[PDB]
Amino acid sequence: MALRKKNSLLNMANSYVLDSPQPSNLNYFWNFGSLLALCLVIQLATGITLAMHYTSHASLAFDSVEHIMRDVNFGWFIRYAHANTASFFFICIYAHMGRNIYYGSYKTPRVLPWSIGVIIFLLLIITAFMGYVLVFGQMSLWGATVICNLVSAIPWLGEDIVHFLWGGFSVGNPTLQRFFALHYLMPFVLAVFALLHLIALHTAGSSNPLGITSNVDKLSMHPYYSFKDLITVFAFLLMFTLFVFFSPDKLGHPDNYIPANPMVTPASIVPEWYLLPFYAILRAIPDKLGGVIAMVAAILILLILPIVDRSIIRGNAFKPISKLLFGFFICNFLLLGVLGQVHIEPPFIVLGQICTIFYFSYFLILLPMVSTIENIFFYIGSL
Amino acid sequence: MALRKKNSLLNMANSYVLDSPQPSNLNYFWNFGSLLALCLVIQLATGITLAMHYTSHASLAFDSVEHIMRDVNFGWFIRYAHANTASFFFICIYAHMGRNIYYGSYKTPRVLPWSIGVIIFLLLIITAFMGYVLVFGQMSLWGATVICNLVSAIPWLGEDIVHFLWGGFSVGNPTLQRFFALHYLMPFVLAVFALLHLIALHTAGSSNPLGITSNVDKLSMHPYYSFKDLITVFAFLLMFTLFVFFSPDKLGHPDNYIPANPMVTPASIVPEWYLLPFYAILRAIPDKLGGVIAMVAAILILLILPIVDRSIIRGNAFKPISKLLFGFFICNFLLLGVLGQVHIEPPFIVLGQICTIFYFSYFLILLPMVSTIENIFFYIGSL
Amino acid sequence: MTAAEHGLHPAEYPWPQNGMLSTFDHASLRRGYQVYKEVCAACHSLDRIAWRNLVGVTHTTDEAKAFAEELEYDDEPDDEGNPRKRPGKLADYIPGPYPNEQAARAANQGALPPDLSLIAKARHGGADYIFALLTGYPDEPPAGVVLAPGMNYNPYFPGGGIGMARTLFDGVVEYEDGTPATTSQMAKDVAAFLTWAAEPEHDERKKLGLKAIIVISAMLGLSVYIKKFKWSPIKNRKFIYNPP
Amino acid sequence: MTAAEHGLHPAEYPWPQNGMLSTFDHASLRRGYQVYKEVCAACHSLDRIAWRNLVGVTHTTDEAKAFAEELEYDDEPDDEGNPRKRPGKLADYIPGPYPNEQAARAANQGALPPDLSLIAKARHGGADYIFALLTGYPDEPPAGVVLAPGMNYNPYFPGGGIGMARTLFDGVVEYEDGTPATTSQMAKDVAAFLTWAAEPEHDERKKLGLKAIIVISAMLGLSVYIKKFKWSPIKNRKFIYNPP
Amino acid sequence: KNVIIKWRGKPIFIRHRTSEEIEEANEVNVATLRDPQTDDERVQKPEWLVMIGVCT
Amino acid sequence: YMGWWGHMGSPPQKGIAGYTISPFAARPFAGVVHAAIFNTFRRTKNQALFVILPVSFFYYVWTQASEKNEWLYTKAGRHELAKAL
């Protein structure tokens, strides 16, 4: 017996990265998983490096970031790499989740990797939120203020919880130092859950674009998907390069280069672009607590896809109506994103409400209806 | 099939903590592994908490630790818990290693968990060394200076490496901020290796005090070792309580309550008690590079125990001469510890050299001789 | 929002540094420092820039040491523990005009002139906004605009009323390189200098990016060849089925 | 090393706070503050202690506010950005006698009197060292000792020559509680107060530890019973072997 | 005039209201107010409007 | 070298009958006093030399070294110290 199979440690690596049996027809949308692993590795390397030069104390934080940009050798690179990779991480995660929804990756027998995936997504949001506060510019402070005040809506105890989270009566030094510590930790938690969702997946193996079994025709992960992953790694690195070297601040907000000032409120407080759709959903509901519930529900409702999809077939490759509904759902999610950063003005207020209703009605009405009807069309159509 | 066996995630937990088949005769020295897991959990909880209130900048570090002691609710507890558990971690790790050496846990088929164990021990040393610097008292600074200067002995590049590690020309703010970041990281690396040595162990299972197979008579890990582990957990917590609440500074150096001063040198620069034997070994060799090699070799020589132990029998329970040699080896290791903190004066200089020779001659001469002879005595004696 | 509440959006000017492969014009940087020093520094600090930062960008080591040595900085106390001053060194930061915000506001009818070290990155528009603002004070505010006391009309500034008056007029500076110091020229130079102050790694960053683009592109091309090479047995596979 | 280089080791005095279940004597703490204030504070700071720290330990809220309000602290600048002083508040730290190290050393023939906030934890001996040192200046140095200029002989201090002279003499303080202020009494009180300053959690810590000891002990006893209960089928196992 | 005092990091608006300002405030029928309150409930002294100057 | 329940890797077992009683049927502390006194004495007696011999030797060595070191740094030990350095 080969050492890679005999030795228990080597065999665990072997089972994931070498002998792992994969469908022979994964398309390029199966490459986001390895891009996400790459973002996670870049964020760990750059993040740990920034932590060697960053100071979490509110009197020094913003200046320690300027020291990184100005005095630390390649500090500008490490900082911009870290900041831009946070955006790339969300592009890859939206792509990966979109792949999963289009190809029915959430259906049995892959409910568990999908459900753990939904938690990975929440951990990414919290990680990135806390990391953004660490700069302690105007957007850092005011973003922390507004998002942490949503907790005040929790009945009875909400206010007490907010003061507890802040470690004081407003966002200040105690908040910044605790966000540093948690921002350092959360990526490690996230890596554990990323590992858990893969181990859970390994019981069924990867799904594939046709939605059928691949047990009939398997290909080793290496060398086929190793070398296929390199193409997208280099495509990603080219995009990374164009932002980090040629346009390092395109994805950011200029106000975050102004030091936090609790007195002056910035003209407009918007979240980082990747949180914008959830912010639009929150604005749609007039009630504070209503809005928070809606915003959270918008993520937790992903957990019911295994139930509301009534199809006897996995995935959308062969379902023209489901494909059109998916197209509308995705475009609506991008419209919500856009509406998250417009001013609260007519006519965007009502549009945001319509888009929010469409978002939820996909899960609760349209997908159950369309999936039921297509079942009947497949059966009658092929008689 | 039971869910704990059917579900792949649950089954991994199940295989380690519930259905795991254990020898039915493990004695109380098999309880240090779970105490080490407890220390690691305490250090993660207290360490992450301290990180929420600590400032890594050299102008603020020492005062942030005073702020923790004085102003943070239960800060004194969290700080003393963290500081004392660092010592308990080394008591448990020496006990665990002593158990392993006495009972032959390093022999085939358990060479791999033992070899990974040696690396866990090195990671613990580095973790604890860096954490001690973070206080930035006099011992913090001067300890960092002398230990980091040992790297200057590396030929050709040694000085360059030291300046690179420091991020400057002496221990200062850059060194403190990098040690904070690495001190935060190292415990996570250590937990991964702790997990790896357990997975490696699971192929043979635990050894036992008789040194024979337990495949004939196994007990589930739960409830038997779960409830047996609770006894030592409560014994440990009682010892923890006596230090943390009644004598929180007994294991420390008063000089670490003086803020770091690069000008004034403390009367005596000694390591934390748990590093003292290695320091005595270093002093024994007159050459700088010689001393560093000897100090490292004193740890890496543990890797050759699987070779130099020539016994046909695993462990010392039935080997009276090996038991006497083990007794002398352990007492010599404690003498080295004591000599690590005496002044470099007669007659401790020569005594330290004799003890260092004895330390190495255990591995290189005595254990190979004694184990060979006992093989012959068992055979002739039982004819 | 009204366009006035937003501010007029600045034109896109063709800066020398626009262009994937373009550095700053260092002669313009040098001239822009001289505008900072002789006009802006009266009200605005540049606290993130040290004298050493100018060296080999705009000035030689000697010129920058001369600028530093003309100033006095706080020394460590003397032996009786009394305060002392020393002449500046290259490690010193360029000192600001005011001791604190309160003093700054008192000198500027309540308005606080921001520090200019990050201003090119801290405003939408960057150099174009700085150039547009400095050169965009109309002689008369548009009929109907009511300016608050101590405010000046400038359409590029959001709301229109800015507490900074026009400061650049033809020949307020005499450039040392003989360049005609028109309003436009000075605004261009100082906008360039401030852009440099906000992002001093600019030139090195873009050259390293050129190297990255080339290497990464080559690796992308080769990765495509290698993937196709390794996958060809799978792509080319053929079957004959004979039903049992 | 010689014993002189080490310093004489202080006696173990029976402090009220010695004892697993013992708090500080708060009356002694209060008296020790008054020694600090009237003797030590001339040369030594207590920078880690704020006025609020005294409240409900040694003084009432009102007494401590009165102490704070007698001093002047740096305020935020006024509206013209000029420096201002304010009266002290409970949040303020107790102010030290000197502005910097250089001033401190100049007043003490080169020696720097350490801050006393941590001194009880920063010296082997703790309270016993402080008490021994303050009360251990012999009238005459042992025959043969040559003291350096500005040094005083004290055997408890390592090397023997300390730059602090004897300061406690009978009746240098008049205690407000009528206690006879002997050298010994003042040294005991101030040593107690400084021990409190180094470890103000002392009283709460030891009481929580009593609760921990009791709970943890009970849990240890019960864990032994439960382990024996669950293990009894294994311990009690019996075998009959009939060789096949 | 309205002052802005930092108090626990939050701004405090302190307005020294004139007589006619107080009058203007005491006009609005309490009935038509999202949060129904009269100035008398808010201030303990009509000449000192003290509020936490964070928008609700 | 270890399997799992059902196939642990034991050589075939035959001819052993094992018996035990319920934890609720048993006295957990049966024979505790005899164990605590006589069993502990036996176990301790049989291991005592393996602790006593190395501990006593290394304690004697330390004692001699620490006493000499103390003596060398007295006035009386001036001459012997001078030679030792």
Ligand code: HEC
């Ligand atoms: C004597 C006063 C004075 C001089 C001279 C001066 N400024 Fe200003 N400047 C101000 C004040 C006051 C503000 C704040 C205006 C406000 O916020 O209303 C300001 C604001 C600015 C802003 C930011 C406007 C914004 O978007 O917030 C920039 C950029 C600026 N100045 C650049 C310059 C440059 C470049 C020069 C000269 C070459 C210059 N200033 C000269 C007083 C001055």
Ligand code: HEC
């Ligand atoms: C007028 C000067 C002066 C007064 C009064 C004074 N000290 Fe000091 N003290 C010093 C100087 C100077 C040193 C440093 C001595 C040295 O390092 O040589 C010192 C050192 C100490 C030390 C540390 C000695 C060591 O181990 O490093 C303690 C403890 C101490 N003082 C406590 C007190 C207490 C308690 C009081 C009064 C109740 C007091 N001092 C009054 C000048 C003074």
Ligand code: HEM
């Ligand atoms: C999933 C992984 C991570 C994500 C998505 C993430 C995201 C972010 C984001 C969005 C910021 C704000 C960046 C900016 O605009 O300047 C940031 C800052 C920071 N992150 Fe992370 N991060 C991650 C991992 C880490 C890790 C592991 C560390 C280790 C400490 C870390 C340390 C930092 C530090 C010190 C900063 C502040 C300095 C700065 O702004 O550049 N991050 N992070």
Ligand code: HEM
């Ligand atoms: C750090 C973030 C993540 C990483 C590194 C990661 C990584 C991966 C990898 C390597 C795979 C197998 C290859 C592939 O299909 O692309 C995969 C599959 C999967 N992931 Fe993720 N993932 C992450 C986040 C998520 C999230 C947020 C979800 C769900 C909301 C998710 C759900 C899934 C599912 C369902 C699969 C199996 C899909 C299939 O093969 O059909 N993942 N992931």
Ligand code: HEM
């Ligand atoms: C964080 C440090 C460590 C943890 C948490 C840990 C934990 C454990 C645990 C739970 C076990 C199984 C139960 C037991 O025998 O006690 C074990 C076994 C073992 N550990 Fe460790 N360990 C650590 C460090 C080490 C070190 C430093 C070494 C070696 C130098 C080591 C070598 C072993 C060996 C050889 C075994 C198998 C012993 C046997 O059952 O015969 N471990 N460890």
Ligand code: HEM
């Ligand atoms: C194996 C785990 C760990 C060990 C052995 C360890 C050891 C130490 C030691 C010896 C100190 C010096 C303590 C003192 O005298 O005050 C210390 C300080 C510190 N450690 Fe750790 N540590 C561990 C894990 C962690 C972790 C996970 C964190 C997370 C950040 C952390 C954060 C800190 C901080 C902030 C300090 C400085 C504050 C202080 O001195 O208490 N430690 N650690």
Ligand SMILES: CCCCCCCCCCC1=C(C)C(=O)C(OC)=C(OC)C1=O
């Ligand atoms: C994060 C990695 C830490 C690894 C340790 C966690 C496991 C907790 C200890 C449990 C334990 C195991 C696994 C074990 O195998 C064992 O049998 C030898 C024990 O008791 C005698 C144990 O106590």
